[PDB]
């Protein structure tokens, strides 16, 4: 029913950019979540 989520191209978004700063880098903090 649902295709599998896919890694989007590096976001040029203003939201994705802001989030990367408000929470830190995902690939770095990922292993702690």
């Amino acid at each position: 029913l649902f295709a599998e989520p896919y890694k989007v191209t590096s976001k040029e978004d203003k939201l994705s950019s802001r989030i990367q700063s408000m929470l830190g880098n995902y690939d770095e903090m990922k292993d702690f979540i």
Partner: protein
């Protein structure tokens, strides 16, 4: 009744604590500390996240009626957790909680005598406060959390542990650092947490094979504006928090 424990920004601004001259940001801070304390105690008492979550919601709701002036967050949190533990069928002995509360609030002093006066007094102060919480909440103890909806959804859209665990993580964070539990229904908050985890993690959920966006399988009111609007509000609330070592740490 349905819209009883949900408030507008006006109602949140005009809180009981505001009535006694507490900065909006200072009240937000008080809540964040109570949650942090609830989370700490919870992990020590060894209760599930669900138990903590509930206690946190009890707390958020408690302070839409009572003031931080009249009720310290450090007195209420233990009582709230004590109550939540019973409600969620993970009851912890009254002694156990008061001790653990001391371990968190006073890592210094010797665990007071269990036969002394100042202690027996704490046992009553907590039991009393539990009773006040119950009355303040109108004995409405059954809480619905975003986590339930987050899981059911990430299951549906075949998310990786990577993404699923991050969404779940964001859910817990929303209870800690924001008052979304007082503003938006759990299903909506779940969508915000997923949408956020996706942006952060760079995953994108396709449209289903029935031409319906993933959030439509969680809540029929959610739109992409709302997801952007609430994600914005979320990030905004985070920006205002003092040390964001609170996010990634506990």
């Amino acid at each position: 009744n349905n819209k009883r424990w949900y408030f507008t920004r006006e109602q949140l601004e005009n809180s009981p604590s505001r009535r006694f001259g507490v900065d909006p940001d200072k009240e937000l801070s008080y809540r964040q500390q109570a949650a942090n304390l609830l989370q700490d105690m919870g992990q020590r008492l060894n209760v599930s996240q669900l138990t903590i979550n509930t206690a946190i919601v009890y707390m958020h709701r408690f302070y839409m009626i009572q003031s931080f002036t009249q009720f310290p967050g450090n007195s209420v949190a233990p009582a709230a957790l004590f109550l939540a533990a019973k409600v969620e069928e993970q009851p912890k002995k009254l002694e156990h909680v008061i001790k653990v509360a001391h371990t968190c609030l006073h890592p210094q002093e010797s665990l007071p005598d269990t036969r002394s006066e100042a202690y027996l007094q704490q046992v009553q102060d907590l039991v009393i406060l539990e009773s006040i919480i119950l009355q303040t909440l109108g004995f409405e103890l059954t809480i619905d959390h975003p986590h339930t909806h987050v899981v059911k959804c990430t299951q549906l859209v075949r998310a990786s542990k990577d993404l699923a665990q991050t969404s779940y993580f964001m859910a817990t964070n929303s209870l800690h650092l924001t008052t979304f539990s007082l503003q938006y229904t759990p299903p909506v908050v779940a969508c915000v947490c997923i949408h956020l985890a996706c942006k952060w993690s760079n995953w994108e959920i396709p449209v289903s094979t029935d031409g319906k966006h993933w959030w439509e399988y969680v809540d029929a009111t959610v739109t992409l504006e709302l997801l952007d609007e609430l994600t914005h509000e979320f990030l905004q609330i985070l920006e205002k928090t003092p040390n964001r070592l609170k996010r990634i740490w506990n």
